[PDB]
């Protein structure tokens, strides 16, 4: 059909399937996952082992792939589990498990190398001369949509200066209570940028959460060099759109649009159905307007790292011991 296989819908996994494909086509991450020393792990208790199983099935199987073992592995079985969490939190669970299992191994540091960026959070008072420059690391960025036309305005809002004035002034300690400014500036941007849009806000005296189906534009190519304190020639902050995680409905149907090779040949992944689609269906048709189908997550890849992030993955990159273990489990399932 398309050389790509889908994932079976077996429950209220919601965004999970959409996330998995996005993680599966992060080829460097997939090859890193394949090499994790999971030989001694418990099959039904190891999240990395479940992820290796899922990636192997997505790469080799011709039939839709199931995720019961994975969902049992990270223990999201309560009724509201997927509804109570967001995609960032599930991605953090999976990647934290993977990174921790990679600690003390030959594939250590892959997660920070692919998804970690550096940020500066600053607080400076206008009256007294004091400055706090707490430095923070990030693996995902949650951009606001309400009132923002496109990604550029959302980023401007993210680095916007916030005024801490009377009745909300900043305690400068030795300098006493002072009026100040709080803000955030970007130091670095990861090779793989996980942007999540904020399409649900609390509404008092109402149904407590209304879906924000407002129009919001995102470009195929995202220049973010202007949002860095110090730029760098020969490595500009130009990013290529890679994944578009889309939701239809209200407070739903979750579908992921992906061009795995970064060539602009877009595909639609609707659980077990993977088809070819236009760029317009993947980008223009998911801005939102007045329908209910709009994008909630964007995944960008830096232009200078595309080839390394999207390394071609052959069936030989999977360690033969892992292949034997997975084949053994498949044999038992067949019997």
């Amino acid at each position: 059909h398309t050389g790509y296989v889908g994932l079976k819908n077996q429950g209220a996994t919601c965004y999970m399937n959409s996330l998995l494909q996005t993680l599966f086509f992060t080829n460097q991450l997939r090859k890193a996952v394949y090499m994790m020393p999971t030989e001694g792990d418990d099959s039904s208790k190891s999240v990395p082992l479940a992820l290796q199983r899922v990636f192997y099935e997505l790469q080799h199987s011709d039939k839709p792939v199931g995720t019961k073992k994975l969902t049992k592995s990270f223990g999201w079985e309560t009724l509201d589990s997927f509804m109570q969490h967001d995609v960032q939190e599930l991605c953090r669970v999976l990647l934290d498990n993977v990174e921790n299992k990679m600690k003390g191994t030959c594939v250590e540091g892959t997660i920070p190398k692919l998804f970690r960026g550096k940020m500066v959070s600053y607080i400076q008072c206008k009256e007294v001369d004091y400055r706090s420059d707490r430095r923070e690391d990030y693996y995902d960025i949650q951009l606001s949509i309400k009132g923002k036309k496109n990604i550029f305005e959302s980023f401007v809002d993210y680095v916007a200066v916030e005024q801490l004035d009377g009745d909300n002034k900043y305690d400068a300690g030795e300098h006493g209570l002072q009026e100040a400014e709080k803000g955030v500036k970007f130091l670095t941007l990861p090779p793989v940028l996980h942007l999540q849009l904020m399409r649900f806000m609390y509404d008092p005296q109402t149904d407590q959460n209304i879906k924000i189906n407002d129009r919001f534009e995102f470009p195929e190519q995202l220049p973010l060099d202007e949002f860095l304190q110090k730029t760098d020639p020969k490595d500009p902050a130009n990013y290529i759109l890679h994944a578009v995680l889309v939701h239809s409905g209200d407070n739903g149907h979750y579908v992921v649009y992906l061009n795995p090779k970064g060539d602009g040949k877009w595909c639609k992944f609707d659980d077990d159905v993977v088809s070819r689609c236009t760029k317009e269906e993947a980008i223009e048709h998911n801005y939102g307007g007045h329908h209910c189908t709009n994008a909630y997550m964007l995944v960008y890849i830096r232009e200078s790292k595309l080839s390394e992030v999207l390394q071609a993955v052959t069936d030989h990159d999977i360690p033969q011991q892992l292949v034997e273990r997975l084949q053994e489990e498949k044999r038992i399932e067949a019997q």
């Binding site: 509804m83 967001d86 995609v87 904020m198 939701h247 409905g249």
Partner: peptide, 10 residues
Amino acid sequence: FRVNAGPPRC
């Protein structure tokens, strides 16, 4: 504000 659907978180 929230990115996905579900119960309120605020």
